[PDB]
């Protein structure tokens, strides 16, 4: 039973592409075929385009309820 926004807001995209860029850095396993760039944010932003970031988001409602959205499920805007 999950009734929240189907879309990924800008703050979602900020935290996902920040943690995943630190989950590319700190010698963490990269999960896409790449060309040789050296910035973690470009890797973590080309993984969002390829639906590869495996993060679950706990969108807290004000009660304390949480819905578990996957980054794969959320429609990102172009």
């Amino acid at each position: 039973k999950r009734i929240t926004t189907p879309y990924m807001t800008k703050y979602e995209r900020a935290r996902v592409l920040g943690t995943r860029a630190l989950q590319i850095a700190m010698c963490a396993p990269v999960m896409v075929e790449l060309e040789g760039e050296t910035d973690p944010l470009l890797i973590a932003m080309k993984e969002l385009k390829a639906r590869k970031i495996p993060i679950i988001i706990r969108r807290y409602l004000p009660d304390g309820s949480y819905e578990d959205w996957g980054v794969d499920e959320l429609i990102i805007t172009d």
């Binding site: 800008k10 703050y11 995209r13 900020a14 935290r15 592409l17 920040g18 943690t19 860029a21 630190l22 590319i24 850095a25 700190m26 010698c27 990269v30 050296t38 910035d39 973690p40 944010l41 890797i43």
Partner: protein, 632 residues
């Protein structure tokens, strides 16, 4: 590795007891001399090394650590006679101006104390539907039969306040709503301002022991048929709480458990010891001399009490000529001077007389030169530069020109991966004075390397041992991080005062312009910052860690902060030359030829990754001509 994961989910504060601080303290001071004559901190004094260390080179004598590893230890100044508590002196006076000495009760009517007891145990749960229902049933039970003989409880009030507390018990944590704390502060304020006034005692039917207060240092009783000492005030008020602890602890939800069944004691209104703050939290001071004044007055009190404990004369319950009343051997004035000095310690408005004061903890905490505005909500930051802005236009609107006097000092810690190596190899080879990038690297186990700028072998040595975990630790927890210089894509966070709206701080991409000493902005930015180029000076904050770069690309970027929060109009455009140039170029009369159109288009664009596609002539013959609208 070695970092806290235990968060915090709530805070609460109440008073220490007089027993808790005695075993949270370490050393008693007993010496009114804060510094010696040699230069060392004073032995068994106020900057004693049994407390925290008074410098950065000596250690502590309680837990043996230096200034970087300790936090100081609490001492205490023993007080031989009891003083009032300067925080809760006003509520003590209001618990004596509404109480009397004949019967140890309070002169308030008991038709409303039971109502406030009955409501403030409901709002501890936070029901709030029945703060009017309890006064409705109080008025109905008081009109159907008048009964002053109901002394302790009323069964019809207590049936509801034990019904909606036992039932509806799970919402003991949803009491933090505004509607609950508003109502409870309202009811307690109506109590202290409406039902706690001095009146003739209706329970004992005798004369009133009237009390009155002056200049926040003195309580005086009167005669029913005069300086109220704090020892007799303890011996009086303790009996008051042993009679009225069922209600005077649900006003004062105090130390723990919300004062349930006589928990909050009369030990926090009265002080017989002054705990000093630790030595490193008061640097070498205005707050040490307050404690020295208290301690010298304690020396005077001991000088008096050694003479009032004579076997010839014992009046207690010249060699000291400097006390005031030289006639009588009592000297209440010394003790009220001690309580006034304690008032000087905790505040500086409860003192009105003593000129040898320096501001106490209220003036340290309250105003804009305090803590919550100067040090706790806005802090002096690191990794940020400041310089004068100047006009520039051949850099992007999401761009900032940065000098190479800032890109030799502004450093970003990059985690060494096997993915972004051979770029940080070059940025250790360069050394900290040359900017394609350079270093100040820290190793695995956590000590800095400090590569020197005069040599080259001791920099290529680091530039080859980078990716290898050459420590040999039993657990690999982290990698080497190189303190890289700022390069031509990095976000600096740009600040212009007064920061009066949301586009008054933005995230601009750095661009290291060589041979300069000013910041540079494009002209579209200097309307959102409200800049005027005439000596305006900006702060260039540089996010050190890595989640400070993600909102800096996505959220705080200049590109999306094109509109204004006020009504959504654009706050980015082109100011002065361009509105004339585009009104004259795109006029119907302009006709370029083929060599000029191709120059204008490539002055407009610059090194874009892509084939520059072109239009065709507006006039094909007699000459290939391009109108100025075709360039745009």
């Amino acid at each position: 590795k070695n970092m806290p994961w235990r968060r915090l989910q709530g805070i609460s504060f109440g008073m220490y007891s007089a027993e808790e601080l005695k075993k949270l303290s370490v050393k008693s001071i007993t010496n009114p001399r804060y510094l010696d004559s040699l230069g060392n901190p004073s032995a068994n004094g106020l900057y004693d090394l049994a407390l925290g260390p008074a410098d950065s080179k000596e250690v502590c004598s309680t837990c043996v650590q230096d200034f970087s590893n300790c936090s100081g230890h609490l001492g205490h100044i023993e007080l031989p006679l009891t003083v009032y508590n300067p925080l809760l002196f006003d509520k003590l006076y209001l618990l004596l101006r509404g109480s009397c000495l004949n019967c140890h009760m309070l002169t308030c009517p008991r038709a409303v104390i039971h109502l406030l007891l009955c409501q403030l145990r409901v709002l501890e749960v936070g029901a709030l539907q029945a703060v009017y229902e309890l006064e409705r049933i109080l008025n109905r039970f008081l009109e159907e039969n008048p009964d002053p003989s109901a002394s302790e409880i009323r069964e019809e009030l207590e049936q509801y306040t034990t019904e909606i507390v036992q039932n509806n018990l799970l919402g003991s944590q949803g009491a933090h709503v505004k509607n609950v704390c508003e109502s409870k502060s309202k009811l307690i304020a109506l109590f202290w301002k409406a039902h706690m006034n001095a009146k003739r005692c209706p329970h004992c039917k005798t004369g009133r022991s009237v009390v009155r207060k002056e200049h926040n240092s003195k309580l005086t009783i009167t005669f029913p048929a005069g300086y109220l000492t704090p020892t007799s005030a303890r011996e009086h008020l303790s009996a008051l709480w042993k009679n009225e602890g069922f209600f005077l602890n649900y006003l004062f939800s105090g130390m723990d458990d919300d004062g349930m069944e006589s928990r909050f004691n009369p030990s926090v209104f009265f002080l017989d010891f002054l705990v000093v703050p630790p030595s490193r939290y008061r640097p070498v001071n205005g707050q040490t001399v307050n404690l020295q004044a208290v301690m010298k007055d304690v020396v005077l009190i001991r000088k008096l009490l050694a003479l009032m404990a004579q076997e010839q004369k014992l009046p207690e319950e010249f060699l000291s000529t400097l006390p005031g009343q030289s006639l009588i051997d009592k000297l209440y004035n010394i003790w009220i001077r001690l309580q006034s000095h304690v008032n000087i310690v905790f505040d500086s408005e409860m003192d009105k007389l003593m000129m040898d004061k320096y501001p106490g903890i209220r003036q340290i905490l309250e105003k804009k030169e305090g803590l919550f505005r100067k040090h706790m909500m806005g802090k002096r930051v690191d990794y940020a530069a400041r310089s004068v802005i100047c006009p520039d236009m051949y850099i992007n609107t999401n761009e900032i020109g940065i000098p190479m006097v800032f890109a030799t000092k502004l450093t970003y810690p990059q985690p060494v991966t096997p993915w972004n190596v051979q770029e940080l190899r070059q940025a250790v080879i360069n050394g900290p004075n040359v900017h394609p990038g350079a270093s100040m690297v820290i190793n695995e186990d956590g000590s800095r390397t400090a590569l020197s700028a005069v040599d080259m072998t001791q920099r290529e040595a680091v530039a080859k041992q980078l990716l290898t975990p050459a420590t040999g630790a039993p657990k690999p927890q982290g990698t080497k991080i190189v303190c890289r210089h700022v390069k031509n894509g990095d976000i600096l966070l740009l600040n212009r005062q007064p920061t009066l709206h949301r586009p008054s701080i933005q995230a601009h991409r750095a661009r290291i312009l060589p041979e300069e000493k000013v910041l540079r902005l494009h002209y579209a930015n200097c309307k959102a910052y409200n800049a005027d180029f005439d000596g305006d000076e900006m702060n260039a904050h540089f996010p050190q860690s890595e989640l400070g770069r993600a909102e800096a690309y996505v959220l705080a970027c200049t590109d999306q902060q094109y509109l204004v929060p006020k009504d959504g109009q654009p706050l980015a455009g082109l100011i002065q030359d361009h509105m004339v140039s585009g009104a004259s170029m795109t006029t119907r009369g302009c006709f370029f030829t083929r060599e000029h159109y191709m120059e204008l288009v490539y002055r407009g664009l610059t090194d874009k990754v892509g084939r520059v596609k072109l239009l065709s002539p507006s006039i094909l013959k007699p000459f290939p001509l391009w109108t100025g609208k075709q360039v745009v």
